[PDB]
Write a protein that binds this ligand. Structure first.
Ligand SMILES: COc1ccc2c(c1)OCC/C=C/CCCCN(C[C@@H](O)[C@H](Cc1ccccc1)NC(=O)O[C@H]1CO[C@H]3OCC[C@H]31)S2(=O)=O
Ligand code: NA
Ligand code: NA
Lengths: 99, 99
């Protein structure tokens, strides 16, 4: 689709067998999802955004469906106020910014 | 242009005759710039991101050029780690997300 930016660019995702709503976020390097369990190994990580840092769990090789499009990549899990699809997965659905 | 997301979508902006670098950020509702001098009146605003809230100063009706596109709108000034062009100005430059 072409998504205009009058409102937040929210889409449905499927992750870890769960449906969630998430923001398509070109300003996020990383994909960050609210607390949930994911299978497999993880390691801690700190990520910093506009209000400081949060601790997250880094899970690699996680399959996700974003607005119908399947991809695989790293997912960070932790106390983000909003679920965000960052560039690491936006590239895999072929998302571009156009103006 | 058409901007892929394999690197941060960093562009040049011009505010007050000075050039700065900023991130085109679909996950930001508003535009947030590092401390600088702007004309006119302001009002403090709290915005919530990853990490928590920060206080910013809201300046309305600011002339700002983004990647050569002229805009006139609200700029929040405060301790952001990166200059961010949010949806309030991405809509002024006719930006869309496409996949
Ligand atoms: C109202 O106007 C605004 C203005 C800005 C924001 C906002 C409302 O958020 C609203 C609430 C949503 C929060 C949910 C997620 C955060 C949303 N944000 C924009 C986002 O693009 C920031 C922009 C950014 C970029 C660099 C440093 C700091 C911030 N990126 C970010 O936090 O990314 C993290 C995940 O990947 C990693 O890569 C970059 C840092 C890290 S934001 O800055 O908090
Ligand atoms: Na894994
Ligand atoms: Na003003």
């Amino acid at each position: 689709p072409q998504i205009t930016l009058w409102k937040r660019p929210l889409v449905t995702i499927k992750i870890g067998g769960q449906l969630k709503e998430a923001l398509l976020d070109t300003g996020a390097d990383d994909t960050v999802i609210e607390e949930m369990s994911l299978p497999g190994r993880w390691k801690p990580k700190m990520i910093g955004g506009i209000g400081g840092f949060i601790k997250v769990r880094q899970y690699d090789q996680i399959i996700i469906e974003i607005a119908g499009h399947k991809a695989i990549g790293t997912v960070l899990v932790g106390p983000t106020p909003v679920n965000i699809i960052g560039r690491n997965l936006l590239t895999q659905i072929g998302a571009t910014l156009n103006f």
